[PDB]
């Protein structure tokens, strides 16, 4: 038997219960990009990884990278994730006349963070993804035969919600009061809003001056170092093979 969560999970309860334990994730925020603690690269806010920032804003578990999180062995605390957020966010380029200690002078110029802790709550999509991943993960062979999915989900639901409210009401006022009392913060938002839809000479001069430029004309940039990584992989494979011989 395992202790079951309360009806409404709050950051206070989770942070107090699991105090003294390592956080699940650490994220550093910069002016225009972010990264994790052990990540050497970076992610742009305009890249596909904006979903993680959206989930952080909404305090929801990111089910879309569940398999990646599993591969890394990230810890869960009653199905939630504790995340630490570090806030680092808070001449004449392309001129040949600039000086630099490694360059000749040139004759045309005269001469030379706040920290935060947050909690992300689970959702139904997360459980769906968990069961789906278990269905296609080899260990019978497979880790979970589909025909047992309903029983497994029933047992998980039984463990998650051990107590319900099974007391009948006698009139409409009692039902109204019960509905009012049981309201949930995550399901009490509001309905969304309807969806809605001098220098010209300088710009034209620049556009004219960039005529027939193959690459810069189209723009008028997210490096990933894929060729370098391919070279590294091939070099490692060749060296390892040479080890045998």
């Amino acid at each position: 038997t395992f202790d079951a969560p309360p009806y409404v999970i709050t950051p206070e309860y989770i942070l107090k219960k699991f105090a003294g334990h390592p956080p699940s994730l650490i994220v550093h925020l910069y002016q225009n990009h972010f990264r994790f603690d052990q990540q050497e690269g970076m992610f742009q806010y305009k890249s596909p990884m904006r979903i993680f920032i959206e989930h952080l804003r909404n305090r929801t578990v990111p089910h879309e990278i569940m398999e990646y999180l599993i591969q890394g062995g990230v810890p869960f605390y009653e199905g939630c994730l504790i995340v630490q957020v570090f806030d680092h966010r808070t001449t004449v380029p392309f001129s040949i006349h600039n000086h630099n200690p490694y360059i000749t002078p040139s004759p045309y110029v005269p001469y030379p963070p706040t920290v935060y802790t947050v909690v992300l709550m689970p959702t139904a999509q997360a459980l769906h993804t968990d069961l789906l991943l278990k269905t296609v993960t080899p260990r019978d062979h497979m880790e979970l035969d589909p025909k047992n999915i309903y029983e497994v989900e029933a047992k998980i639901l039984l463990a998650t919600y051990p107590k319900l409210d099974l007391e009948p009401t006698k009139n409409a006022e009692e039902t109204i009061a019960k509905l009012e009392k049981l309201a949930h913060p995550e399901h009490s938002h509001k309905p969304p809003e309807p969806k809605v839809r001098d220098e010209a000479l300088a710009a034209e001069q620049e556009r004219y001056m960039l005529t027939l430029d193959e690459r810069l004309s189209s723009k008028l940039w997210e490096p990933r170092f894929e060729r370098f990584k391919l070279i590294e992989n091939i070099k490692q494979e060749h060296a390892e093979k040479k080890e045998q011989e």
Binding site: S95, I103, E206, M209, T211, D213, L216, F225, I234
Partner: protein, 478 residues
């Protein structure tokens, strides 16, 4: 015309110049000018010169000039404005400056002016590793350049300091160039296969001599060669001609088709020669090497025809005939200060031809029929010496060590092996173990008096460094 255009342009009202500039750009890029490419005074040159004689008051985009100069032989007219706009840009804007610099660097690269290219790219970069790598590439130190480029990429991965895209492309391109200079073909082949680089793939595949013997392998390479043939270039035409020669050798083609292919290649080479500046620049050297390659292609075709026809009847008399041509070939070499890739190409081509000869002559014997091995040994030794003079680490040693296994021990091959062994003494520090082991015992010294005398002299000189004064004294006294 070039005297009249500025005077008439001076009379145009300042408010109407942009319309005439746009019209001039439209007229310069017309498609009917291609019926005038070969005539030397052509209208493109005159219009460009007239426009550039009044550059500040008449502006033409840099890349229009760059595109037209390469096709209509107006190189220096474009260089004038391109490197005058770097000193004093017409418009204050980063994009315009970057585009002008890109066009200028492209022209420098096409004309073969290496030093100006490096000097221009070193005043433009932001990282210090890029500067150091370019400087080390300037003095032909490829290992250090590769290491600096790797360090630059690794430090850029962090992302703390922003960079541009041009440096990002430069790192990869010049890493590949340095890898080519260091003879790292084994990994470049797989890199090109993964990246879908057809020309690099052909360059790598051409370096494997045995790969071209299998019928399936050459049937495969034919598809790639035909795929890269809708944009003919001199190198692609050379590869096509080589494939045609291989097909002819195996009675799958008539000599007439081979001759037609060679004629097309020669015509394209002449056309490309006619588009360069009249006076001999650094861009003419590869074309001369290509001319020599075509001549030797025809010579090798004659070799194959005569060999097959005469050996069809088992007549072992044509060795003397082949000796004359081989001796003639022994005197057509590049200059010592030429690019190393040229020597690589020469060695590979001669190895292919000698392999053909050896394959034809081996099936007949079961002395006179072991000349390909001697020629290969000679050319490999010469290339090793040249590579040593280029200060290439381990390339000379690698070439001298890859010749360990060679059959048909003969007087010529034995003498070449002894010369190679005498060449093993590089006079480099920290090589005492090899010298001591050689001194312990190395073959026999009964071959010839001068060879043993020079071996003893080398032994004494080696002992001199270790401090064995009397030992070396006795050694070279003997």
């Amino acid at each position: 015309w070039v005297a009249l255009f500025p005077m008439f342009w001076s009379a145009v009202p300042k408010e109407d110049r942009p319309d005439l500039e746009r019209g001039l750009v439209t007229l310069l890029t017309k498609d009917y000018h291609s019926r005038q490419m070969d005539k030397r005074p052509n209208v493109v040159q005159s219009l460009m010169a007239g426009a550039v004689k009044t550059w500040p008051h008449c502006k033409i985009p840099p890349h229009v000039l760059k595109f037209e100069a390469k096709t209509y032989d107006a190189w220096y007219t474009a260089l004038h404005q391109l490197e005058n706009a770097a000193i004093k840009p017409e418009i204050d804007s980063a994009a315009v400056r970057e585009s002008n610099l890109d066009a200028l660097v492209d022209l420098y690269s096409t004309l073969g002016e290496d030093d100006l290219f490096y000097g221009t790219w070193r005043r433009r970069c932001q990282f210090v590793e890029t500067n150091a790598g370019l400087s080390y590439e300037q003095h032909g130190m490829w290992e250090k350049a590769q290491r600096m480029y790797e360090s630059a990429q690794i430090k850029a991965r962090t992302g703390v300091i922003p960079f541009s895209e041009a440096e990002y492309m430069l790192w990869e391109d010049h890493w590949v160039l340095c890898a080519q200079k260091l003879q790292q073909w084994e990994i470049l082949q797989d890199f090109a296969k993964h990246e879908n680089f057809q020309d690099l793939l052909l360059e790598c595949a051409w370096r494997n001599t045995e790969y071209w013997q299998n019928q399936e392998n050459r049937d495969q390479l034919d598809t790639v060669i035909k795929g890269v043939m809708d944009a003919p270039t001199p190198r692609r035409y050379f590869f096509q001609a080589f494939m045609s020669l291989l097909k002819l050798h195996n009675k799958q083609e008539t000599p007439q088709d081979f001759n037609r292919v060679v004629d097309e290649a020669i015509q394209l080479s002449i056309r490309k020669w006619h588009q360069l500046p009249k006076r001999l620049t650094a861009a003419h050297v590869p074309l001369l090497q290509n001319f020599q390659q075509l001549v030797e292609l025809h010579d090798a075709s004659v070799i194959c025809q005569s060999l097959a026809q005469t050996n069809a009847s088992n007549l072992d008399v044509k060795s003397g005939e082949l000796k004359l041509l081989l001796g003639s070939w022994r005197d057509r070499l590049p200059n010592m200060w030429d690019d190393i890739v040229a020597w690589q190409d020469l060695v590979t081509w001669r190895q292919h031809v000698f392999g053909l000869i050896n394959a034809t002559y081996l099936q007949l014997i079961p002395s006179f029929a072991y000349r390909g091995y001697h020629e290969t040994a000679w050319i490999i030794n010469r290339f090793a010496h040249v590579a040593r003079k280029h200060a290439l680490p381990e390339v000379c040693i690698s070439q001298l060590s890859r010749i360990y296994t060679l059959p048909n021990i003969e007087i010529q091959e034995a003498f070449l092996k002894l010369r190679e062994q005498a060449k093993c003494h590089y006079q480099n520090p920290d090589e005492l173990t090899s010298g001591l082991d050689v001194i312990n015992n190395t073959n026999l010294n009964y071959f010839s008096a001068p060879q043993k005398a020079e071996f003893y002299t080398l032994k004494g000189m080696f002992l001199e460094k270790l401090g064995q004064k009397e030992e070396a004294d006795t050694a070279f006294g003997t």
